[PDB]
């Protein structure tokens, strides 16, 4: 997170750290959507151009964390993975279309002050919140520029499609949106490498609940003027999420 600030405690209790076993390492962000299901970016798990390919037993998740490298005695809970479900139409070759994966944990996580799932949007929520100029919030432990000691947060406005399009040569699809301040706006901020998989969330002014509208997917550099962060469009992939969970069990 570039040009963000330290999170307050229990500000983002659905935040999840994808943690590599050996060598021991932070890989990516993720989010908790129920007691046995975590949502992440597919490219965190599978990206052949970099020779990346992680299986269930290569990884752990850490939930309830604030500090980046300290084990938080009595706060955080660590879980093993039972199964990874990468979207079947993920496209790592071209433009990271459908950059999304679900992970089922081996055991249910007990909720607390510091561990709690985010809501996923429906049609109406999507239609009223995902609009240009509306701001959402991005969180993570990724790079502070083009490494922090506590979780970083930044608020960024959704950008209209034609501006997103004109900002990159990468082929944009309807499974993505972009966010960030325009050069002339003055305020600044972006996600960066290491933040992938983390949620773009918005608080509904109707029922005051936080909804995950996006997943940190890609960008070109970090916080460059006239460039914007790209996010997987969570509602557009909601039918797939409900299908996987309904079939494989909560």
């Amino acid at each position: 997170i570039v040009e963000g600030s330290d999170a307050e405690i229990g500000m983002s209790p659905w935040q999840v750290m994808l943690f590599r076993k050996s060598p021991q390492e932070l890989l990516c962000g993720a989010s908790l959507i129920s007691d046995r299901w975590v949502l992440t970016a597919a490219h965190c798990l599978l990206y052949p151009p970099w020779d990346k390919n992680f299986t269930e037993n290569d990884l752990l998740v850490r939930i309830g964390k604030h500090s980046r490298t300290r084990y938080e005695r009595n706060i955080e809970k660590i879980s093993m993975l039972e199964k990874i479900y990468i979207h079947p139409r993920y496209n790592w070759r071209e433009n990271l279309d459908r950059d999304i994966a679900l992970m089922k944990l081996k055991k249910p996580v007990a909720f607390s002050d510091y561990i709690h799932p985010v809501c996923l949007p429906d049609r109406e929520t999507a239609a009223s919140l995902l609009q240009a100029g509306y701001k959402g919030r991005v969180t993570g432990w990724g790079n502070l520029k083009e490494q922090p000691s506590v979780l970083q947060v930044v608020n960024l406005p959704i950008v209209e499609r034609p501006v997103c399009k004109d900002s990159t040569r990468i082929r944009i699809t309807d499974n993505m949106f972009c966010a960030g301040y325009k050069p002339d706006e003055g305020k600044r901020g972006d996600a960066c490498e290491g933040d992938s998989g983390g949620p773009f969330v918005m608080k509904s002014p109707f029922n005051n609940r936080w909804y995950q509208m996006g997943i940190v997917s890609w960008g070109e550099g970090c916080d460059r003027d006239g460039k914007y962060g790209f996010y997987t469009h969570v509602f557009r992939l909601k039918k797939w999420i409900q299908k996987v969970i309904d079939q494989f069990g909560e």
């Binding site: 209790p13 608080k203 509904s204």
Partner: peptide, 27 residues
């Protein structure tokens, strides 16, 4: 069913330092 209401925030009727910026960005 309990989703998206934070134990330290919404459940306590306390806000975080920056959510107001989000709310104001709507209409």
């Amino acid at each position: 069913a309990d989703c998206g209401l934070r134990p330290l925030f919404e459940k306590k009727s306390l806000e975080d330092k920056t959510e107001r910026e989000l709310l104001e960005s709507y209409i």
